[model samples]
Target: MGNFHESSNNIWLEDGHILHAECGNGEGDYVESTLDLDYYIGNDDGSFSWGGENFSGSASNITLDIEGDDNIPVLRAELNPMDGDPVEANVNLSERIGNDCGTLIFLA
Candidate 1:
């Protein structure tokens, strides 16, 4: 299981959706996660498969603690939105290299 917690906030999406609500962490770990898939068709060629992962909040405030298990793994986290405003972030947990490790994708 997963645990997620967030404070009171309001968010506006590009698709003209307003979301104002509060989220809380559960008892166990890995409370919430989203999954998405995409498909593409070609002109008498071949089909393509694609997918993506999305979430809201900062990685620091949002904790993802994972534990290895025999059958399945346990992941937990508490996510918090940015201060005052909703920020866009594109983060992929790829292999890190140096101090910077990699790039932090952020959008305004």
Candidate 2:
């Protein structure tokens, strides 16, 4: 519920940033989101936007509820897009890459 991280590819672990991207198009172009679990524990929510890497649209209202602890994490949310309709997102995290950091990646 806490201290768990989710990243871009597989998953990430951050203090408040819970990553989840929802794509409308075929490509990987989608809204990258992050949840604030530490700041607002009870009122846990996050902000996301189109072209999350390039900043195409403004950050819309999107809140994801993370479920799981010892097992894998399941992320569920409905993102309100800037142009398109609401997107229903369901993310199921896979096996752990490591307990360290996936921020600095190695291709080996």
Candidate 3:
């Protein structure tokens, strides 16, 4: 995990489309945050996948409080031009480095 002092109000891409939005206390503490796996794709050889069994092109929106800091901002992301809902999730802040509050796009 990256030091909270080494980040801004935004998050970085630590795992493909996964954003590393963590702050305060570099310890292995868990907090509930938003994770919107907007849009994604997987290509192999000459094949392509999009919103199919091999692909899910839908988007998501999630809202949660970070630790005990209600002053912390939340991030809203969309995959494509699609729509979805937001859910609560328990995220480990010590898994990745850096921080931000914004939407991120990824392709693989």
Candidate 4:
């Protein structure tokens, strides 16, 4: 929502993974995963879609948003997997450590 541009936004999730705060039964807890870069689909338009298929579950309905430049990074998603309860994730990714997977996430 700030100065981020679709034309300016060229991305490949670093290490092929991103950190997520997620939960199914109640709400969420931060979890990190590594997977294919094809899951990131930020394309020619403003519409950006991302998803990951896994042995435990598949991720969908993933929403991403930001508010301001000072300190506003936001992302969300609801993952409905066949394993158990539907999972939900909403993260203010202002703090993180290390990296993993296809190259762990990078967007601009």
* TM-score, per-candidate, Cα-based: 0.17, 0.28, 0.24, 0.31
Candidate 1 TM-score over all chains jointly: 0.17
lDDT of 2 at 25: 29
Write the residue-wise lDDT of candidate 1 on 1-108 in tens digits: 111112211111121111112232333222222212111101111111112223321222322222334221112222234343333222221111011111111111
- Every candidate's lDDT: 0.20, 0.33, 0.32, 0.34
CA deviation > 4 Å runs, candidate 1: 1-53, 61-71, 81-108
Q: What is the lDDT of residue 41 in candidate 4?
A: 33
- Residue 43 of model 4: what lDDT? 19
For candidate 3, the 10 contiguous residues with the lowest summed lDDT are 47-56
lDDT per residue for candidate 2 within 47-90, as digits (tens), equals 22221321112223333344666454543445445565655544
**2 or 4, which is superior by TM-score?**
4
| Worst 10 contiguous positions by lDDT, candidate 2 | 49-58
Runs in model 4 with CA error above 4 Å? 1-57, 67-69, 81-83, 97-108
Predicted model with the maximum TM-score: 4
